[PDB]
Design a protein around this ligand. Structure first.
Ligand SMILES: [Mn+2]
Ligand SMILES: [Mn+2]
Ligand SMILES: [Mn+2]
Ligand SMILES: [Mn+2]
Ligand SMILES: [Mn+2]
Ligand SMILES: [Mn+2]
Ligand SMILES: [Mn+2]
Ligand SMILES: [Mn+2]
Ligand SMILES: [Mn+2]
Ligand SMILES: [Mn+2]
Ligand SMILES: [Mn+2]
Lengths: 244, 244
RNA sequence: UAUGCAUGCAUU
RNA sequence: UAUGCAUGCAUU
């Protein structure tokens, strides 16, 4: 665990950058009934080596929409600087994702994604500023947080009531809202596919509304994990595997 | 692949040893409705290090009917011959025989009354698969259990075969594998109610096919019978506990 | 045999 | 995040 000085610096940085988050739609395709104008959807992920605390592999992919085919992949081995601490995920993974976005601008600027799906929460976060917000503010790209487990903050809990609501999700696209003790809607549970029971937890990262974020996440789901995140996960793990 | 002159020598050896296979019951517990008298069921497997020489050969003995492991011998070995379909014994069997001999020296009262082998017996290009080969070299009763169909003597995994598999509806259901010669070479077996891919069971030595199938079914907590499953799990764990 | 993917359970 | 197991499909 990092020293308190590091964690203090981290909390202060999250509070500083949180003032820049935009939690409403700012792109014309977002207000379109079929997302007309949306052509490129990004996904990011970092995979790790079981033996090694230093080496990781970061991946950025860009997919065509609505076809969901990979038109760009950049995967690179990186040197880890921070350990994993819940609530501070960005300080472990986000510096490498920002660099991949910058490399894309240098290499294939016409494939810059119009929105990025991030493997982690956005505003559903201990301090309202998860990795998806953090990437969005540092890149100014619209970003969606997609998490596979419920971050138990603001009274949210994976209890019997929560599991009851999960059973009530019956088809792909069904949802229920994640309400905090303050009464605010932090995100949505989403049944991403007809043949999956475990929901995704979707929240706003940056420059998108929750309703649009949920609907786009659903439209990217060939399987349970949305295809951009899924392809970034698959390809970064393949890189680690082929270099053992 | 070994040269054809080598494979021809191996075929000749398989033909000579086949004269020693006994494909009927020779143990009093075998004809018993509940296998009363059966206390010890063996299982063998060889796992490999993803390096072509090093492997881990495992012998387990399980109590019956509780299916609890009362003996495990997992041994790193230097494997020499490559896998050639129809010649599996020339890769794995010398090391399995050595494990049985080690058991006799170490815990002779735990010698198994029957061994389940991860591979075919008489269901085989020349009617003499690895399970027959282990049985004849140890004189132990042996059952061959394969996880996919060896396509010999007109047997094929075609649509007709797949339709018969769909007719297997409950755990214990079987259908016979009839060769073009008119012989019943083995049985397809549905291991349990929640599995659809069958096991392919055949006589190794000193057991009838009907008894071999019924005992295989009694060892199935999951799709793979518990003696083979434990040998597979524990030999893989042994490899990880060193190299993995 | 080893690996990949899908779906779920557990551990972390 | 990584690992184990379960069930299926695929490559070999
Ligand atoms: Mn379009
Ligand atoms: Mn991730
Ligand atoms: Mn991942
Ligand atoms: Mn690759
Ligand atoms: Mn008994
Ligand atoms: Mn095997
Ligand atoms: Mn095995
Ligand atoms: Mn295996
Ligand atoms: Mn999984
Ligand atoms: Mn993972
Ligand atoms: Mn499997």
């Amino acid at each position: 665990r990092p020293p308190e000085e590091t964690l203090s610096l981290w909390k202060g940085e999250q509070a500083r950058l949180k003032a820049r988050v935009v939690d409403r739609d700012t792109e014309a395709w977002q207000r379109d009934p079929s997302f007309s104008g949306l052509q490129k959807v990004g996904g990011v992920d970092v995979s790790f080596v079981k033996g090694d605390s230093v080496r990781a592999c970061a991946s950025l992919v860009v997919l065509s929409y609505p076809e969901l085919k990979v038109v760009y992949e950049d995967s690179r081995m990186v040197g880890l600087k921070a350990p994993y601490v819940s609530g501070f995920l960005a300080f472990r993974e986000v510096p490498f994702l920002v660099e991949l976005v910058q490399r894309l601008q240098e290499k294939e600027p016409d494939l810059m994604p119009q929105v990025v799906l991030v493997d982690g929460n956005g505003v559903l976060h201990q301090r309202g500023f998860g990795v998806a917000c953090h990437l969005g503010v540092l890149t100014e790209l619209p970003c969606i947080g997609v998490a596979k487990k419920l971050l138990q903050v603001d009274g949210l809990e994976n209890n019997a009531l929560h599991k009851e609501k999960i059973v009530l999700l019956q088809a792909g696209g069904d949802t229920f809202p994640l309400i905090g003790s303050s009464g605010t809607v932090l995100g949505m549970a989403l049944r991403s596919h007809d043949h999956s029971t475990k929901p995704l937890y979707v929240s706003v990262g940056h420059r998108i509304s929750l309703e649009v974020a949920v609907r786009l996440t659903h439209h990217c789901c060939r399987f349970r994990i949305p295809e951009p995140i899924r392809q970034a996960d698959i390809r970064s793990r393949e890189y680690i595997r082929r270099t053992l």
